Design a protein around this ligand. Structure first.
Ligand code: J1X
Ligand code: J1X
Length: 263
């Protein structure tokens, strides 16, 4: 069956020229709305949530882990390092790296999280341990954002990412304090006001992680507390066939607006 919401999302997609993937979980009734929900999309920096969450899980058996220093050397800086470049020839704690990766989208900070987990496969191993059989992280920053059509590397599906984000932020994949920490970090994101948030009523509260890359890839994953109802989890992924395409945060906002109007 195709719903009215799905027809609206298909119209939005057709007007955009690209490929749009949406998954909503409404935690009041556990129902789901999907559009291309089982197709693969490049995650880009939305993968930083899984990396930070994997380090939070390690912290549950090491009370001092988030205070642990990690060396930032000049050779470690990559292509987008707004926080890490202030700490070159110094250190950042795993908490500081997590906050930088999530709230500022710092790519050097992400690379330190991946290294703490033993490489991209250590992030995938955590995803499997929390029931996500779809997520895969194959590369470090910045090349995990190449976003080449048909490339399986560094991809997931909307359905899988929405289920995982629900389990991490609202369910019991993390201990209570760690889940609260992840929620606090997401709610303090600096990069999201033009993406999912821009399609939602202003009274609703959002925590989110954005991503973008080549092929005009533009992504956002969010946990949403709407006024007067239980939380929603929403993933909006978008990628374009035209390699030099501009990113389209407004398409993510428009998908969120359609979803909100359908509730
Ligand atoms: O910094 C970024 N992108 C980046 C960084 C370094 C190199 C290149 C690149 N390499 N080759 N060509 N461009 C691109 C970047 C982009 C966006 N964004 C643009 C459109 C939609 N979202 C948002 C953010 C932020 F959320 F963090 F704020 C960072
Ligand atoms: O690293 C990147 N982008 C980035 C960096 C930091 C934060 C964010 C972000 N966060 N939230 N939204 N965007 C995005 C990035 C971007 C591009 N690119 C090419 C055309 C447009 N883009 C290519 C590459 C790669 F060639 F190396 F693969 C990496």
């Amino acid at each position: 069956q195709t719903s009215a919401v799905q027809q609206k999302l298909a119209a939005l997609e057709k007007s955009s020229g690209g490929r749009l993937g949406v998954a909503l979980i409404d935690t009041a009734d556990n129902t789901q709305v999907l559009y291309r929900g089982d197709e693969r999309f490049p995650m880009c920096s939305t993968s930083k949530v899984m990396a930070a969450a994997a380090v939070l899980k390690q912290s549950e058996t090491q009370k001092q882990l988030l205070n642990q220093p990690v060396e930032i050397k000049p050779a470690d800086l990559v292509n987008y390092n707004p926080i890490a470049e202030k700490h070159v020839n110094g250190t950042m704690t795993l908490a500081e790296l997590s906050a930088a990766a999530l709230q500022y989208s710092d790519n050097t900070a992400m690379n330190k999280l991946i290294a703490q987990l033993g490489g991209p496969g250590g992030v995938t191993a955590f995803a499997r341990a929390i029931g996500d059989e779809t997520f895969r992280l194959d590369r470090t920053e910045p090349t995990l954002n190449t976003a080449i059509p048909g490339d399986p590397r560094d991809t997931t599906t909307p359905r899988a990412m929405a289920q995982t984000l629900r389990q991490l932020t609202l369910g019991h994949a993390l201990g209570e304090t760690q889940r609260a920490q992840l929620v606090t970090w997401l709610k303090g994101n600096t990069t999201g006001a033009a993406s999912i948030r821009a399609g939602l009523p202003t009274s609703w509260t959002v925590g989110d992680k954005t991503g973008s890359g080549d092929y005009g890839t533009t992504n956002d994953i969010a946990v949403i507390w709407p006024q007067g109802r239980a939380p929603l989890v929403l993933v909006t992924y978008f990628t374009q066939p035209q390699q030099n395409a501009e990113s389209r945060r407004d398409v993510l906002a428009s998908a969120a607006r359609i979803i909100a109007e359908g509730l």
